[PDB]
Amino acid sequence: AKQSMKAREVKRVALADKYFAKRAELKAIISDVNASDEDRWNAVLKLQTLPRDSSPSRQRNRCRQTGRPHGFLRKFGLSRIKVREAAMRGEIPGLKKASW
Amino acid sequence: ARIAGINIPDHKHAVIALTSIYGVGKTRSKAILAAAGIAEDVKISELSEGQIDTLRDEVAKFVVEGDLRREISMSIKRLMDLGCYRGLRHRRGLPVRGQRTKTNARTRKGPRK
Amino acid sequence: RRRVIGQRKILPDPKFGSELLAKFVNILMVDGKKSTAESIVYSALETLAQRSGKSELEAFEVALENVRPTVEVKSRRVGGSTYQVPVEVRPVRRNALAMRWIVEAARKRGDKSMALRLANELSDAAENKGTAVKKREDVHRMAEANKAFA
């Protein structure tokens, strides 16, 4: 990962709280074709693409101890090489190779 | 016999010579069997003149018989310019939809020597 | 006496008149789909009795009496040498092999599949004619051209 990525990280999420996370239940209901003569929303759909570098498809969940979008387990926030230690240090509830 | 089916097997099932012909397949074959109200199981009903040939009107809203390709065989001539992606791909045997040519193209390229 | 014999494994049928049944319906059987290999019992011989002569009481009994393997020839160790020897076909196999060996014409005769194939290959086998019989006498003479030690 680029060293700029940890500065991009906090810029992306702040733009998503300003816009995307406050518009998602509105964007799903402007799909209307009932208004009489001309469209009422056609000129405002472009708000989905208005900010730069910030979008839900760029803003993937990512690993939370390594700088990777890929090779992760969401229920931990970790990759296999950190799960092999965390399953031996838990902390993480119920995580064991049986034996109770 | 052969009142609507153009082939000599006249003692067989209601798909034989009554599907994939002159703009008719299973769905539109059912639609004229439905127009005449007849029976179709194991064999098609034995029928005479003036019973279903009079009802070809009830399935007429498609490209059929002498009209199956007639007007599109002139409309498809509209784009022919070599700078036009659709014009060039009509003027040569090419897919206007686009396909891959490197790997798994051997139907379109035909047999290899 | 507890652990003795142990008996059964398979049982004799009162209507079929042959104990080969449990290995005869094991032929052309795939992914455990037995009923698509058992499709020749009271069907193919009912058709043979309508394609060659009359009755079916001895047709499958006499066809496997006419096509009968008795010897097989292999390269076998005496140590370190591996001489060719004739060996007799083992008693539990002796009448159970030939019924599985009629395959080198099956995709060529155009007999319209399964029960209708069987209704044609048996009328050749009941004279020791047709498929694989030239190869049977070729093994019989492969064991005549050399008889080894017995």
Binding site: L73, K75, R80, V83, R84, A87, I92, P93, G94, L95, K96, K97, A98, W100 | - | -
Partner: protein, 98 residues
């Protein structure tokens, strides 16, 4: 109207927390529903273990939870309060609904 659930990440910890509320259930009503055992939930994971490829080297884990319903069986402010000094046990989760 109210609903209660008690979940734990250890088959002895589910008893340690249930023991507060099955005895609270004896300080109310007249009949008790015991623990109400419910089916256990098992969450599993199959993972790789080699530093690089080796498809013959694979590993697995499991996280199982034990769930008890108990039922509070009568409207009493003292019996729902028994859950307010209970969720703080390491590996426990209390869920109150309605």
């Amino acid at each position: 109207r109210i609903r209660i659930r008690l979940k734990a990440f250890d088959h002895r910890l589910i008893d340690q927390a249930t023991a507060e509320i099955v005895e609270t259930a004896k300080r109310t009503g007249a009949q008790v529903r015991g623990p109400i055992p419910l089916p256990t939930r098992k969450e599993r994971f199959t993972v790789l273990i080699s530093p690089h490829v080796n498809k013959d080297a694979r590993d697995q884990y499991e996280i199982r939870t034990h769930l008890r319903l108990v039922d509070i069986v009568e409207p009493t402010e003292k019996t729902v309060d028994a859950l307010m000094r209970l969720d703080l046990a390491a590996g426990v989760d209390v869920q109150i609904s309605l």
